[PDB]
Design a protein around this ligand. Structure first.
Ligand code: NA
Ligand code: NA
Lengths: 737, 368
């Protein structure tokens, strides 16, 4: 039903725009899009070529980009920009610098609007594959639009009499076939009075066709006072003909108001699949902003042909195929919570994503791990397997079982000749030794830990097909994490190919056999077997103590006499020293581990503390020094009250919900409610629970329990209930249990 | 190091810098041939007992392009100091018309590149066989470094900021790394309960020591934004440092005064400009502390830096006139000062991101 404040109204696309470390994979741009849209749009302040496309502290705008960028370091491909200008014409991105104030900027998912200091106003709204702009030019100043087709070998053609511009952009950062291009077209509402092209060296007036390394074109207008210029645009990865089909289907005849309303409706539809009630405006903004961020990637990479059928340009083999393709995703990051969120609330997406993984395998020989748009060398692991198996175990079964199994096994028994992250780096050593050795293989221990998990997923998959021999082969590798636990030191470490432990153990030392972390983080990377990890650590007791040594309260000695303001200044210190590296991948699940070892109240306390202290909805809203936006799905799940600790096992460990109520609108008209009528900032603890009206003491919900609809009714309290959730029957899955 | 005669202390051949910086500014009171002989000898010889007199490890340096560790103590710091002295000698020889000698020394000016560890993005160390020392650690003091770690010493390339940015991946990455050194502290959501809790938080960041003010190899670092397109950041951060890291009381400095050096940084920075690279007669512009400074130079010439609307929260240069003409360069030459005149600055509470961002505006780099 219509509401005064709709879910999309809570979204701030600039949340955490100042929260990201320069040398991380976190994006900072206010994406204008529809969910999973093939093309995104954004303001651009950075130079062409810079992954730092939009920098909040920069006050000069250069263009509005059609972008696909999933990380500043992965960078962009198939990108061009459009830039309206008043007064003086400037062609090169190096010279198009127009001052604006954030006070005259309004960024939302369905429309970005900005008014420059010179009074020129523009806004744009996106469809899946196109966009529409309005431009209001200042009176009595020259009126231009510049189209920038980027460098790397581009072309632009102007047809002034038809008010059309078409072109091809080929800029990319690798991972593309030899015939790669994005074919674009745009239409202007008003007569093109003058026009010209630029080839990176010379501005050529009256010329209408240009091709060079770097190309731009300008159009000059004479829009009458009171009127606005509309620009309609769409692109395709298939051909100029398909770009025109996309244009005609999605943006032809539209003004920005039409596209804006449609995108707003789409966002409200998709965001509204989880309805949060009974929270502050700040909490609602944080939640829906994180959810918006979560519904952007991976992007759909398919298009609908003249017959309305889905087709795609393959970024793996460069041919056009029937069916579905997605891209722009690092599974090493997104298997943990983003794809699990899809399997629950957006399973129609997982249905197509899983098919696309197999398609990429058919087209290239390997499943992707980091793709943008094709195979890119980045990060580690075989988490492609997790997406397939997690979905399969939740009843999302669109791929052929035998083909999927073959692909999974191959991913663990081969590696790309050039790209270490494609397939399994070090598989020969791992199969022989039970671990990947360092310094023989970079990041060996983090790899071993990721591989033991992927092998557990493959065992689970094979077992569910009745292929018990293959399952037992893979279950034999599931405990390989144990092979790197250094008993004298009580942490994961590394060995060379001869079995010698690396000299001078140091739990805090980054790099080497570890990835983006140290043993302090990577020791927790055993989410398929928390019970087996506790065994290594000497039992539930020692494990609880080590978790406690990550989330411990600040020490204020006798200084708290100055007030409660003392414990706040004191809490900063632990976070700044980084005892808990919120966002660090191998410990994203760690707060939930208390659910497995008998003290769920600690999960409840710490989770609620993190949600309150490390998030807000503003420009620095991903507060964790180690959080560069990657915890968006983590926040959505955690606010709802539960989290997929081990994808591939259809279970969600229970934390503590943020709102008085969330309602999940699931397939086939089923609704699942988590109600917490007496929830409050100082009432993080679950005293009692009813599941569908029956006393409920388990520390997890199954996917089936959610999917069938119903209600988890929680009685929240300010003190923990130490008699609840402490029995072995209450604990979620472990391989060794 | 002299007190009163030769004393074994510290490193480098910066005697050469005193001679060359003065010479290139027109101070020429020594025999040119004798000075060149002495400079060359300083790089080709070492005192039998005192490591800091002459060039410790010169044999290795000339052969390998760097001083190796553990063969020579403090090898990486020495290499970086030597690359700069060699650049100075090249400048001197060139000005005398000795182009061959100049070219031989200019070939050594880029030796700083030989210790940049690409995998890690910091200066590090190699042994004589060319093997990187195991267990890289950017914050590890001692060994191949002195009075600092790679974190500090990575910035010790005053004769070639452009070439340093090249190693780092360009202007933007170098900006990003400077920004992290000078970043204001993270206050999470604690900003609500109190304030300036941000001020208190700043003191913690300084206790931690992200930017080691006074630490020699990074003294110039705040001025580097002048070389890479964002002078407004130099302006903001310099003024912050001058306000927060100095006072006139008994605990007035953040570290050793050092024979006028920490003191001289403050004097230059308060006047509005700083000699990033002695031996090159120019001064990178920062942001003046006062509404006016007048320098009384030789031959009755006076140079004025005026900033009539200067104030504590107006650290930025909106606009400048040099001797009445629009001025956008991020440096003044020694000749511009010496001849007398005025740099008239319009100060502002917000940065002017359109000013001083062009290649023509950047000061000297050997690589440019
Ligand atoms: Na952050
Ligand atoms: Na705004």
């Amino acid at each position: 039903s219509k509401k005064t404040v709709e879910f999309v109204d809570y979204v701030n696309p600039l949340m955490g725009t100042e929260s990201t470390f320069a040398f991380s994979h976190g994006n900072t741009y206010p994406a204008v899009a529809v969910p999973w849209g093939m093309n995104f749009w954004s303001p651009q302040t950075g130079e062409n070529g810079s992954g730092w496309m939009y920098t909040y502290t920069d006050s000069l705008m250069r263009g509005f980009r059609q972008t696909h960028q999933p990380s500043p370091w992965i960078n962009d491909y198939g990108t061009f920009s459009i830039m309206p200008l008043a007064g003086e014409l400037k062609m090169s991105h190096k010279e198009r610098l127009v001052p604006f104030s954030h006070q005259q900027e309004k960024a939302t998912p369905y429309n970005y609007s900005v008014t420059f200091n010179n009074g020129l106003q523009t806004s744009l709204s996106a469809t899946s594959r196109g966009a529409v702009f309005e431009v209001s030019f200042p009176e009595k100043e020259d009126q231009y639009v510049v189209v920038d087709a980027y460098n790397g070998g581009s072309s632009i053609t102007i047809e002034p009499e038809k008010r059309l511009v078409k072109g091809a952009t080929r800029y990319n950062n690798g991972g593309v076939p030899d015939n790669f291009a994005n074919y674009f077209m745009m239409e202007f509402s008003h007569p093109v009075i003058e026009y010209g092209t630029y080839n990176g060296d010379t501005l050529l007036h009256h010329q209408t066709d240009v091709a060079a390394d770097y190309t731009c074109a300008y159009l000059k207008f004479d829009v009458p006072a009171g009127e606005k210029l509309t620009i309609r645009t769409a692109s395709s990865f298939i051909s100029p003909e398909q770009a025109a089909i996309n244009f005609n289907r999605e943006v032809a005849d539209a003004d920005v108001q039409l596209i804006s309303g449609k995108a707003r409706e789409q966002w409200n539809n998709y965001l509204g699949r989880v309805e949060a009630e009974g929270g502050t405006d700040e909490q609602l903004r944080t939640f829906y902003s994180c959810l918006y961020r979560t519904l952007l990637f991976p992007r759909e990479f398919y298009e609908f042909d003249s017959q309305g059928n889905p087709v795609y340009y393959s970024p793996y083999d460069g041919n056009v195929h029937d069916g579905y393709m997605y891209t722009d995703n690092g599974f090493w990051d997104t298997f943990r919570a983003v794809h699990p969120l899809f399997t629950l609330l957006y399973p129609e997406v997982s249905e197509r994503v899983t098919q696309s993984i197999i398609n990429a395998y058919n087209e290239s020989g390997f499943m992707p791990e980091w793709a943008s748009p094709g195979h890119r060398g980045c990060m580690i692991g075989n988490n492609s397997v997790s997406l397939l198996v997690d979905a399969w175990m939740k009843g999302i079964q669109t791929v052929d079982a035998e083909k999927a199994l073959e692909a999974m096994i191959h991913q663990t028994q081969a590696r790309h000749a050039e790209i270490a992250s494609v397939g399994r780096d070090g598989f020969e050593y791992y199969d022989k030794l039970g671990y990947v050795p360092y310094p023989e293989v970079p990041e060996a221990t983090a790899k071993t830990l990721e591989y033991a998990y992927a092998d557990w997923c493959i065992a689970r998959f094979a077992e569910s097909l009745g292929k018990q021999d293959i399952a037992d082969q893979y279950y034999q590798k599931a405990p390989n994490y144990r092979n790197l636990y250094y008993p004298e030191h009580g942490f994961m470490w590394t060995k060379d190919a001869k079995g010698n432990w690396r000299d001078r153990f140091d739990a805090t030392e980054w790099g080497g056999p570890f990835t983006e972390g140290s043993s302090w983080h990577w020791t927790w990377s055993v989410f398929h077997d928390p019970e087996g990890l506790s065994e290594l650590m000497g039992g539930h007791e020692p494990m609880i103590a080590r978790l406690d040594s990550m989330f411990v309260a600040p020490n204020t000695y006798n200084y708290g006499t100055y007030g409660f303001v003392i414990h706040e200044i004191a809490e900063m210190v632990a976070l700044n020293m980084g005892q808990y590296a919120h966002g660090n991948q191998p410990v994203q699940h760690a707060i939930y581990l208390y659910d497995y070892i008998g003290q769920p109240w600690k999960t409840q306390y710490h989770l609620r503390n993190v949600m309150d202290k490390l998030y807000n909805s503003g420009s620095k809203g991903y507060c964790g020094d180690e959080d560069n936006g990657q915890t968006s799905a983590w926040y959505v799940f955690s606010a709802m009250g539960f989290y997929p600790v081990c994808p591939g096992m259809p279970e969600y460990a229970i934390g503590s919900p943020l709102f008085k109520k969330v309602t999940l609108h699931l397939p086939e008209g089923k609704n699942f409610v988590v109600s917490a009528a007496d929830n409050a900032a100082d009432r993080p603890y679950i005293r009692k629970a009813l599941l569908n009206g029956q006393e409920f003491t388990r520390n997890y919900l199954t996917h089936d329990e959610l999917k069938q609809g119903g209600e988890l009714n929680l009685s929240m309290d300010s003190v923990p209930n130490q008699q609840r959730g402490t029995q072995p029957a209450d604990f979620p899955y472990s391989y060794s249990k």
